[PDB]
């Protein structure tokens, strides 16, 4: 509908597509088998970003009050983009940068914003992978290192930090992070973290050395292992003592928070992180398929798996959440029993959870003075299930503590960190695709040089940038990417992709194109979502996102041993300078879209 002259010149002819598959055998990569492409899409739409983020956001809002908005926006904003990206890649036979540049020369900014976004989400997820590897390397020890505390110079006093907190909390914050007390206290590089980061980048390079020539064989183990191990852990999680307690707890959501715009905004932005939309890897990967490949059926199959896996992983987390809360309730309970048995010297086993409050009174009446000094605890289990976990605690605090309480704890630790490592890797193949393909399409390195050279330099460059997260104050920096700074760009790119395919390229041409590729015009579901539903929803979510999420003062959680109510949470304000960083990390990619477009319409004059 917007005037676009010269489009037919830039893009391949519809008749030329019939004479391209058997004559472009060289120069362009090809999937060996449909299975390789489907396993790549599985690993990028159900890697981390689905399996890592979703469960955290479930327990940070409400077990079931978040899945409802998530599954609504999956259908109405996610499936439509997923199909659109698959189809446009398959049609125009190019990556994100090739695709948007050919639909209109002013939209090369859309492709540069996807490469930067992909860069930034790769930098984030590979730090998470370096932590996962640290924990996998410490998982070959009968007593897992996070099961006990270190002693003092007297070798008779437990470390005060561990004593005040826990063996796990201390292994995370002190033995892994060696965390400082604020983002301003940079400290120095944790050498053992640096070795883990090098390991993460180096394994990624081994798998991505010749793009899909190498990543397509990697996905046979990397997109199949996670799903079997997540099935095993589902069974073990369900067989837990309190497992069902958490399972019932995520399927009884409070509806008072289903009316909270933050639940809608997080679900909004999670749909684009879950599917790896607006990164540009999906467009590149779909561009290597046959022109007669059914991209509609693929988008639907991937989607169904994405939604089903989101709800499945929420069951595996909450079974473990339920297990932790129940072993707390019991513990706390067993100590309230032990206070009056030690105060009134009652026979052990006489006072039980069944007969406790009665005994409290029977004893209070007997000796109220001898009952007053008996400090007790008020611990209902609904207060334990609804105890939110800040940061990466669900992985390195809740799941790690629960694995130590299981028998053969070292075999469950290795399976858990191998599952997460493969998910990380599968996701990292897409994010690397979304940085490598654009740099190939910017012709910045000598064409003569093998891709191996370009892939290697991206791995070294990003490895060196990731030294900031190896600092004493690294987690604090990684938590800035967890801010709205990590999401605004994704919402802007997704909108612009939808808008440009429907109004700059034309939805009518796009329907004739799909009709050519798969044999039928997309039905009225796709039409409504592509022309109104998806676009409007994306705009609204972007508008309200700034109304509250962006407006709210950026705060973060510090781990200070020297703090009153120490093992409890002290959120502070980030310095003024930090906010500038959030602006550049989110603004540059977003502003690349218009910035490049305005550059192109003042070079024309």
């Amino acid at each position: 509908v917007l005037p676009n002259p010269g489009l037919d010149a830039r893009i391949p002819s519809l008749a030329e597509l019939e004479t391209i598959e058997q004559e472009e055998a060289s120069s362009r990569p090809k999937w060996d088998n449909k299975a390789q492409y489907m396993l790549t899409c599985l690993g990028f739409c159900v890697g981390l970003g689905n399996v890592w983020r979703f469960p955290y956001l479930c327990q940070s809002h409400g077990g079931g009050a978040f899945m409802i908005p998530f599954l609504i926006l999956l259908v109405l904003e996610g499936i439509p983009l997923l199909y659109l990206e698959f189809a446009i890649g398959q049609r125009l036979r190019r990556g994100s940068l090739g695709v948007w540049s050919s639909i209109h020369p002013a939209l090369k900014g859309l492709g540069l914003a996807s490469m930067l976004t992909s860069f930034m989400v790769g930098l984030y997820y590979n730090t998470i992978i370096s932590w996962i590897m640290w924990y996998l390397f410490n998982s070959f020890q009968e007593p897992l290192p996070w099961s006990d505390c270190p002693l003092n110079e007297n070798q008779t006093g437990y470390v005060d930090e561990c004593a005040r907190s826990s063996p796990v909390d201390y292994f995370w914050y002190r033995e892994t992070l060696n965390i400082s007390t604020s983002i301003s206290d940079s400290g120095s590089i944790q050498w053992w973290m640096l070795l883990c980061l090098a390991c993460a980048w180096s394994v990624l390079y081994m798998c991505t050395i010749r793009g899909i020539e190498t990543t397509g064989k990697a996905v046979y183990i990397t997109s199949t292992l996670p799903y079997v191990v997540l099935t095993i852990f589902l069974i073990r999680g369900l067989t837990l003592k309190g497992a069902t307690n958490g399972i019932v707890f995520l399927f009884t959501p409070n509806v008072t928070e289903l009316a909270q715009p933050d639940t809608w905004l997080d679900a909004g932005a999670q749909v684009f992180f879950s599917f790896s939309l607006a990164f540009g890897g999906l467009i590149s990967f779909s561009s290597y398929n046959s022109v007669h490949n059914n991209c509609e059926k693929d988008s639907v199959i991937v989607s169904i798996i994405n939604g089903f896996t989101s709800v499945y992983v929420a069951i595996v987390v909450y079974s473990v959440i339920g297990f932790r809360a129940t072993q707390r309730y019991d513990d706390c309970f067993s100590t309230n029993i032990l206070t009056l048995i030690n105060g009134f010297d009652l026979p052990e086993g006489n006072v039980t959870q069944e007969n406790f409050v009665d005994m409290q009174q029977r004893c209070n009446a007997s000796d109220p003075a001898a009952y007053a000094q008996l400090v007790f605890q008020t611990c209902d289990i609904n207060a334990f299930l609804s105890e939110a976990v800040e940061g990466t605690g669900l992985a390195f605090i809740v799941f790690t503590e629960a694995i130590t309480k299981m028998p053969l704890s070292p075999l469950w630790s290795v399976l858990f960190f191998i599952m997460l490592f493969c998910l990380g890797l599968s996701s990292m193949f897409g994010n690397m695709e979304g940085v490598v393909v654009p740099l190939q399409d910017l012709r910045v390195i000598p064409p003569k040089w093998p891709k191996e050279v370009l892939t290697g330099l991206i791995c070294l460059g990003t490895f060196l940038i990731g030294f900031i997260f190896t600092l004493n104050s690294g987690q604090y920096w990684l938590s800035l990417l967890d801010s709205y700074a990590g999401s605004i760009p994704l919402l802007i790119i997704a909108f612009c992709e939808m808008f440009s395919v429907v109004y700059v390229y034309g939805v009518d041409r796009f329907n004739k194109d799909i009709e050519f590729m798969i044999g039928h015009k997309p039905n009225i579901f796709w039409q409504v979502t592509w022309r109104v539903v998806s676009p409007l929803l994306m705009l609204i979510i972007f508008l309200f996102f700034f109304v509250v999420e962006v407006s709210q003062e950026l705060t973060y959680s510090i781990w200070d041993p020297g703090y009153e109510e120490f093992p409890k949470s002290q959120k502070i304000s980030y310095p003024n300078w930090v906010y500038v960083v959030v602006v550049i990390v989110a603004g540059v990619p977003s502003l690349t879209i218009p910035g490049y477009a305005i550059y192109k319409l003042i070079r024309n004059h």
């Binding site: 590897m133 996998l136 883990c196 394994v203 390079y205 050395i209 191996e452």
Partner: peptide
């Protein structure tokens, strides 16, 4: 260190894989 020795083994096999893979490409002529 157990973590260190496991790390070393993983690194070794990974770098060996990388070397084999790059050499495999050199072999491809």
């Amino acid at each position: 260190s157990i973590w260190l020795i496991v790390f070393g083994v993983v690194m070794g096999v990974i770098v060996v894989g990388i070397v084999i893979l790059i050499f495999t490409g050199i072999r491809d002529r």
